[PDB]
Design a protein around this ligand. Sequence first.
Ligand SMILES: Nc1c(C(=O)c2cccc(OC[C@@H](O)CO)c2)cnn1-c1ccc(F)cc1
Length: 344
Amino acid sequence: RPTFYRQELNKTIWEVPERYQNLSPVGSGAYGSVCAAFDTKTGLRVAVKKLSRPFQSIIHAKRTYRELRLLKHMKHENVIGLLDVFTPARSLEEFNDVYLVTHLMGADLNNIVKCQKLTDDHVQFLIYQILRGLKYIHSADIIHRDLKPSNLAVNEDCELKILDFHTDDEMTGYVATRWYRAPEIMLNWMHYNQTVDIWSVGCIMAELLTGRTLFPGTDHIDQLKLILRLVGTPGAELLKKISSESARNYIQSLTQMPKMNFANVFIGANPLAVDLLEKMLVLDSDKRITAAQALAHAYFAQYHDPDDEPVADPYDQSFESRDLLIDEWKSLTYDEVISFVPPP
Ligand SMILES: Nc1c(C(=O)c2cccc(OC[C@@H](O)CO)c2)cnn1-c1ccc(F)cc1
């Protein structure tokens, strides 16, 4: 057990191992209760997240367990992983606070690229990295579900990590929280798949190429209309898969529209980029390109290396189907904290 010291930061007492020095709040609340620090043991600049007391309810206790399990699993260059996890508690009975330590990133994709068109070379490299991370995440049967520029963090050499794996209110109106969501998830059409994330990548890629939001809808329905104008209205085949009968019924009220010519939308773009976008932005999720398929697309010829695009170890999510008591989720979480082994 290391020696812990106390400091008052985000209106609360942080008790952390001596190895972490010069704690300073970051993100202005937008990432949770997170402080930047210097890890004297590793020489890394790190982010330390103190969970907002994590066992207040069953829902919150399970969410705490979920986040720790996910972060402990992720071991990939393009995905946020766990450098350390600790608690000042000396026993399960004393256990009430969890601190998570990760790499400190420089900026998110949003505040970097906002309103700006990138060069094709830069788009290739950024999207390649996202796809490389997604191949890894998907190989563990994990779906991100909320990919957008604000949960893509980059450093000075354009090296990228996926992080931050919502309420009805925060998804309402003219909001970036919804602009990158696949239509089947936005409108609860069906049980969705991993390629909900590929839709999101398509939206991000389009925006990097143009400097403009692809589907900046003023509400869910306005957004759907923007989407269907580009990709065309659904055919009978997809309509049958919309298991929601009310959703299915609303779609057939719309005047039919053919898919647009993407070369006339993304004017001047690399033809290979246009081709990839056409394969990502397919309405029927069964027919969307996968992360592994996309990595082998000719657009990434200068970066693709099938021997340097690893997959994840299997990830057991059986706990999701389980209904436990707070103290049980808490004990499971404690076991995961005390069993943590840091990376090389
Ligand atoms: N590591 C990060 C960041 C960042 O590194 C980050 C993200 C965007 C911008 C950013 O810039 C920081 C600068 O403003 C200060 O150097 C960091 C944001 N959230 N987390 C995080 C920490 C612990 C966890 F368990 C999970 C996630």
